[PDB]
């Protein structure tokens, strides 16, 4: 147990694509999306 | 379309829409709105006849009318014919019909072509939009054949778009894939497809069968071609 150290140091090595790379990685875990019945409101 | 012509000191200033809930609603076409200035450009103001040199020259009403009457008195029957244009009123049409009938002529024609086989013009519903414009907002499916309703009848196309938006109307077109400002199911431009739909071979035929209030619209422009009767 200690309190002199800072543990949130991972964000020091994030690139510009970290968020979208994480989204791509998470794409495999999601449930199928619901469908409105059309391709677009303009269809 | 119901309109308002606003004049001032005996001159047309502009054209405005006049609200008719069943025809044009609150809107008019750009041709309706902005083509009025053409009424000041190439206008026939005086009677004209051909002179000794074969050129058109101004003339009093009396002499031109006498010339036409003298030429009309000579021939009779099939030798006298008349063609009506696109902006001719009913009164003028009936007057010309009577005048040519007194000569025993029946060659009263219009430039626009409508097939005369079968009923032809004998029954009115053969050549009318029987559903009417306001009825478009009740149909659940509409089939368009050989027409571009956007430019031929802009307010009719606006009504179709309104029903497509609010009543979820289903639209199909047979003809060139023109932009109608709303998405439609394009079946093609070959007229044979029509026969296929009647046959029942085509997928769209079932679609018309399930519909409670189907509509089929045939443009008079498709009737201008050689096989309009077919």
From TrEMBL, chain A:
Transmembrane segments: none annotated. It comes from the Eukaryota. It is found in: Mitochondrion inner membrane. Accessory subunit of the mitochondrial membrane respiratory chain NADH dehydrogenase (Complex I), that is believed not to be involved in catalysis. Complex I functions in the transfer of electrons from NADH to the respiratory chain. The immediate electron acceptor for the enzyme is believed to be ubiquinone. May be the terminally assembled subunit of Complex I. Belongs to the complex I NDUFV3 subunit family. Complex I is composed of 45 different subunits. This is a component of the flavoprotein-sulfur (FP) fragment of the enzyme. This is NADH dehydrogenase [ubiquinone] flavoprotein 3, mitochondrial. The lineage of its organism: Eukaryota, Metazoa, Chordata, Craniata, Vertebrata. The chain holds residues 68 to 110 of 110 of the full protein.
From TrEMBL, chain B:
It comes from the Eukaryota. It is found in: Mitochondrion inner membrane. Core subunit of the mitochondrial membrane respiratory chain NADH dehydrogenase (Complex I) which catalyzes electron transfer from NADH through the respiratory chain, using ubiquinone as an electron acceptor. Essential for catalysing the entry and efficient transfer of electrons within complex I. Plays a key role in the assembly and stability of complex I and participates in the association of complex I with ubiquinol-cytochrome reductase complex (Complex III) to form supercomplexes. Belongs to the complex I 75 kDa subunit family. This is NADH-ubiquinone oxidoreductase 75 kDa subunit, mitochondrial.
